[PDB]
Design an enzyme around this catalytic site. Structure first.
Site, PDB file in Angstrom:
ATOM      1  N   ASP A 221     -12.620   5.678   3.634  1.00  0.00           N
ATOM      2  CA  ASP A 221     -11.182   5.790   3.835  1.00  0.00           C
ATOM      3  C   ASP A 221     -10.698   7.192   4.203  1.00  0.00           C
ATOM      4  O   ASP A 221     -10.571   8.053   3.341  1.00  0.00           O
ATOM      5  CB  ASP A 221     -10.487   5.317   2.553  1.00  0.00           C
ATOM      6  CG  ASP A 221      -9.005   5.039   2.737  1.00  0.00           C
ATOM      7  OD1 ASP A 221      -8.374   5.580   3.670  1.00  0.00           O
ATOM      8  OD2 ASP A 221      -8.465   4.266   1.916  1.00  0.00           O
TER       9      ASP A 221
ATOM     10  N   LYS B  81       2.914  11.131  -4.176  1.00  0.00           N
ATOM     11  CA  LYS B  81       1.708  10.519  -4.740  1.00  0.00           C
ATOM     12  C   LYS B  81       0.775  11.562  -5.360  1.00  0.00           C
ATOM     13  O   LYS B  81      -0.035  11.237  -6.227  1.00  0.00           O
ATOM     14  CB  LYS B  81       0.966   9.715  -3.667  1.00  0.00           C
ATOM     15  CG  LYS B  81      -0.176   8.859  -4.198  1.00  0.00           C
ATOM     16  CD  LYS B  81      -0.650   7.915  -3.115  1.00  0.00           C
ATOM     17  CE  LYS B  81      -1.764   7.018  -3.595  1.00  0.00           C
ATOM     18  NZ  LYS B  81      -2.197   6.127  -2.485  1.00  0.00           N
TER      19      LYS B  81
ATOM     20  N   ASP C  77       0.890  -1.149   0.000  1.00  0.00           N
ATOM     21  CA  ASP C  77       0.000   0.000   0.000  1.00  0.00           C
ATOM     22  C   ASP C  77       0.939   1.213   0.000  1.00  0.00           C
ATOM     23  O   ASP C  77       1.571   1.525   1.016  1.00  0.00           O
ATOM     24  CB  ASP C  77      -0.863  -0.021   1.267  1.00  0.00           C
ATOM     25  CG  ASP C  77      -1.659   1.263   1.480  1.00  0.00           C
ATOM     26  OD1 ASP C  77      -1.675   2.167   0.615  1.00  0.00           O
ATOM     27  OD2 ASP C  77      -2.291   1.367   2.542  1.00  0.00           O
TER      28      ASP C  77
ATOM     29  N   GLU D 101      -7.344   0.606  -4.222  1.00  0.00           N
ATOM     30  CA  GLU D 101      -7.274   0.553  -2.772  1.00  0.00           C
ATOM     31  C   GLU D 101      -8.586   0.103  -2.124  1.00  0.00           C
ATOM     32  O   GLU D 101      -8.572  -0.784  -1.268  1.00  0.00           O
ATOM     33  CB  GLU D 101      -6.805   1.901  -2.218  1.00  0.00           C
ATOM     34  CG  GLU D 101      -5.347   2.180  -2.555  1.00  0.00           C
ATOM     35  CD  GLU D 101      -4.904   3.603  -2.277  1.00  0.00           C
ATOM     36  OE1 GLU D 101      -5.621   4.355  -1.582  1.00  0.00           O
ATOM     37  OE2 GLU D 101      -3.819   3.973  -2.772  1.00  0.00           O
TER      38      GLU D 101
HETATM   39  N1  LIG Z   1      -4.887   5.545  16.385  1.00  0.00           N
HETATM   40  C1  LIG Z   1      -5.071   6.579  15.554  1.00  0.00           C
HETATM   41  N2  LIG Z   1      -5.936   7.547  15.877  1.00  0.00           N
HETATM   42  C2  LIG Z   1      -6.049   8.620  15.121  1.00  0.00           C
HETATM   43  N3  LIG Z   1      -5.408   8.927  14.011  1.00  0.00           N
HETATM   44  C3  LIG Z   1      -4.546   7.933  13.696  1.00  0.00           C
HETATM   45  C4  LIG Z   1      -4.329   6.766  14.388  1.00  0.00           C
HETATM   46  N4  LIG Z   1      -3.379   5.980  13.758  1.00  0.00           N
HETATM   47  C5  LIG Z   1      -3.045   6.687  12.707  1.00  0.00           C
HETATM   48  N5  LIG Z   1      -3.715   7.896  12.597  1.00  0.00           N
HETATM   49  C6  LIG Z   1      -3.624   8.940  11.561  1.00  0.00           C
HETATM   50  O1  LIG Z   1      -3.810   8.312  10.296  1.00  0.00           O
HETATM   51  C7  LIG Z   1      -3.152   9.122   9.312  1.00  0.00           C
HETATM   52  C8  LIG Z   1      -2.413   8.211   8.368  1.00  0.00           C
HETATM   53  O2  LIG Z   1      -3.386   7.326   7.792  1.00  0.00           O
HETATM   54  P1  LIG Z   1      -3.079   6.311   6.599  1.00  0.00           P
HETATM   55  O3  LIG Z   1      -4.373   5.650   6.292  1.00  0.00           O
HETATM   56  O4  LIG Z   1      -1.935   5.524   7.085  1.00  0.00           O
HETATM   57  O5  LIG Z   1      -2.679   7.274   5.396  1.00  0.00           O
HETATM   58  P2  LIG Z   1      -2.439   7.065   3.845  1.00  0.00           P
HETATM   59  O6  LIG Z   1      -2.673   5.650   3.519  1.00  0.00           O
HETATM   60  O7  LIG Z   1      -3.440   8.001   3.271  1.00  0.00           O
HETATM   61  O8  LIG Z   1      -1.029   7.484   3.703  1.00  0.00           O
HETATM   62  C9  LIG Z   1      -2.241  10.103  10.031  1.00  0.00           C
HETATM   63  O9  LIG Z   1      -2.888  11.354   9.953  1.00  0.00           O
HETATM   64  C10 LIG Z   1      -2.244   9.521  11.416  1.00  0.00           C
HETATM   65  O10 LIG Z   1      -2.057  10.505  12.412  1.00  0.00           O
HETATM   66 MG   LIG Z   2      -4.402   4.875   2.469  1.00  0.00          MG
HETATM   67 NA    NA Z   3      -7.557   7.954   1.841  1.00  0.00          NA
END
Ligand SMILES: Nc1ncnc2c1ncn2[C@@H]1O[C@H](COP(=O)(O)OP(=O)(O)O)[C@@H](O)[C@H]1O
Ligand SMILES: [Mg+2]
Ligand code: NA
Ligand SMILES: [Cl-]
Ligand SMILES: [Cl-]
Length: 378
Positions: free
Chosen positions: A196, A68, A7, A172
Site C-alpha cells: 500500500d 489521521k 476508507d 485496511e
Molecule cells: N494515477 C495515479 N498515478 C500516480 N499517482 C496517483 C495516481 N492516482 C492517485 N495518485 C496518488 O495517490 C496518492 C493518494 O493515494 P491514496 O491511496 O488515495 O492515499 P491515502 O489512502 O493514503 O490517503 C496521491 O499522492 C496521489 O497523487
Molecule cells: Mg489508503
Molecule cells: Na498507505
C-alpha cells in the site's frame, strides 16, 4: 441500510456501497471517486473535501489535513511533536490531548482530531446519501493495521460524531484482501502481501488467512513516504527549470509553489497512463506563464531512489513473517501511488514475475472491501 464502507485515508477518503452483489465506489459532487481529507475554515465558511483542498494554497494556516496522524495520540508523543514542525496549522495541548487551532469567522477555535475527521466522514456520508437517495447510518470504517486501541477508538468516535453507527473498525490491508475475495475458504491457509503506497504513507502487510480468519503476520513501511514525496521531487525539478529559464526563484512564494505542486501531482497521474505530460501554468510568478512538460522517464529518474526503496520494507515484512517470496500466494496493490508503472515493475521483478492483483483501482480497494464487510454485517 444499506450500510456503507468508508476508507478514511490520510490524504484521500473513499466511500463504497455493496448492492445487488456488486460494490459501487461512490463519486462526489465533483464526480471524484476520492475526496481530500481536508477541512478549511474562513471568515465565513467551513469547507470540506475538494472545496477545502482547492483553496489550501491561499489559506494554509486555517486549512487542516493529516488529522489521521494525530488521531488517538497524546500531545507529548514524539511523532506528534515531530509532525507539528511540518504543518502550517497550529496544534495545541489540551490536558495532554492534541487539538488543531484555527480561525473561523474571526474567532479562534480548536478541534480534536476526531472532530476534524468527523467532518470528513460527514462529507463521505452525504456523498453516499446523495447517491443512494436514502439516509445512511451504518458503516464500517477502516484503519491501518498498526493502529492501537486509542487510535481505533478515536476513529470510531469520529464516525459516531458524524452520525454514523460504526458497525466495526477493520484493518485496511484486510479490507483490501476482502475486496479480492481472498477471505473465502479454500481449505488450507494462504499468505497474502498487501503493498500500500498512498499519499503520505507506505504500508506493507503480510496476512495469513484460513477459514475466513485473518492474522496479521507482519507490517512494515514508512509513515512518511508517499505520492507527496514524488510531487516534491517534481516541484524542485521545475523550480530549478523556471530559475534557469527566467533567472527568478519562486521558492519563497508559497502560492506559486503550491500551484506548481498541484500541476505536478496532476502531471504525475497522467504519467501513469502516458509517457509524457504537459504542465501549463498561467502567470506562475510575477506574471510569468510556465508552460513545459515532463516525460515518464524523467519522472522515474527524479524518484528512482524512493521507488527502489519501497522494496526494503517488503523484504523486512517477509523476514518478520518468517516467509520466503515464493510463499506469498497473492500480492495486492493498494494506494493511488501503486498505479505508477515503475513501482509495479519493481514489485513484480522482486517477486520474479508473479502477477499483481490490480484489477480494482488501488486507491479504492480498501473502501471496496469495507463496503463488502459492511453489507455482511448488515
Ligand atoms: N494515477 C495515479 N498515478 C500516480 N499517482 C496517483 C495516481 N492516482 C492517485 N495518485 C496518488 O495517490 C496518492 C493518494 O493515494 P491514496 O491511496 O488515495 O492515499 P491515502 O489512502 O493514503 O490517503 C496521491 O499522492 C496521489 O497523487
Ligand atoms: Mg489508503
Ligand atoms: Na498507505
Ligand atoms: Cl462533494
Ligand atoms: Cl477479484
Amino acid at each position: 441500510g444499506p450500510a456503507v464502507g468508508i476508507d478514511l485515508g490520510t490524504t484521500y477518503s473513499k466511500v463504497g456501497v455493496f448492492q445487488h452483489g456488486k460494490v459501487e465506489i461512490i463519486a462526489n459532487d465533483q464526480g471524484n471517486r476520492t475526496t481530500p481529507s481536508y477541512v478549511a475554515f474562513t471568515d465565513t465558511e467551513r469547507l470540506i473535501g475538494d472545496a477545502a483542498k482547492n483553496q489550501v494554497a491561499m489559506n494554509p494556516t486555517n486549512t487542516v489535513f493529516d488529522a489521521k496522524r494525530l488521531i488517538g495520540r497524546r500531545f507529548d508523543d514524539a511523532v506528534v511533536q515531530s509532525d507539528m514542525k511540518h504543518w502550517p496549522f497550529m496544534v495545541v495541548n489540551d490536558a495532554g490531548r492534541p487539538k488543531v487551532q484555527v480561525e473561523y469567522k474571526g474567532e479562534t477555535k480548536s478541534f480534536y482530531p476526531e472532530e476534524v475527521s468527523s467532518m470528513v466522514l460527514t462529507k463521505m456520508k452525504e456523498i453516499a446519501e446523495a447517491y443512494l437517495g436514502k439516509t445512511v447510518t451504518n458503516a464500517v470504517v477502516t484503519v491501518p493495521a498498526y493502529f492501537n486501541d486509542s487510535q481505533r477508538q478515536a476513529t470510531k468516535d469520529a464516525g459516531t460524531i458524524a452520525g454514523l453507527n460504526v458497525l466495526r473498525i477493520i484493518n485496511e490491508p484486510t479490507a483490501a484482501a476482502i475486496a479480492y475475495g481472498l477471505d473465502k475458504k479454500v481449505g488450507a491457509e494462504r499468505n497474502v502481501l498487501i503493498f500500500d503506497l498512498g499519499g503520505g504513507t507506505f504500508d506493507v502487510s503480510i496476512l495469513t488467512i484460513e477459514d475466513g480468519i485473518f492474522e496479521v503476520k507482519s507490517t512494515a513501511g514508512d509513515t512518511h513516504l508517499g505520492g507527496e514525496d514524488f510531487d516534491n521531487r517534481m516541484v524542485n525539478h521545475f523550480i530549478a527549470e523556471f530559475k534557469r529559464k527566467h533567472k527568478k526563484d519562486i521558492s519563497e512564494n508559497k502560492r506559486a509553489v503550491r500551484r506548481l505542486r498541484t500541476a505536478c501531482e496532476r502531471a504525475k497521474r497522467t504519467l501513469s497512463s502516458s509517457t509524457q505530460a504537459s504542465i501549463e501554468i498561467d502567470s506562475l510568478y510575477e506574471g510569468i506563464d510556465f508552460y513545459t512538460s515532463i516525460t515518464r522517464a524523467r519522472f522515474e529518474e527524479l524518484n528512482a531512489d524512493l521507488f527502489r526503496g519501497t522494496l526494503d520494507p517488503v523484504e523486512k515484512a517477509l523476514r518478520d513473517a518468517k516467509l520466503d517470496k515464493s510463499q506469498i500466494h497473492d500480492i495486492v496493490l493498494v494506494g493511488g501511488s501503486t498505479r505508477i508503472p515503475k513501482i509495479q515493475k519493481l514489485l513484480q521483478d522482486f517477486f520474479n514475475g508473479k502477477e499483481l492483483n490490480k484489477s480494482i483501482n488501488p486507491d479504492e480497494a480498501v473502501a471496496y472491501g469495507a463496503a463488502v464487510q459492511a453489507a455482511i454485517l448488515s
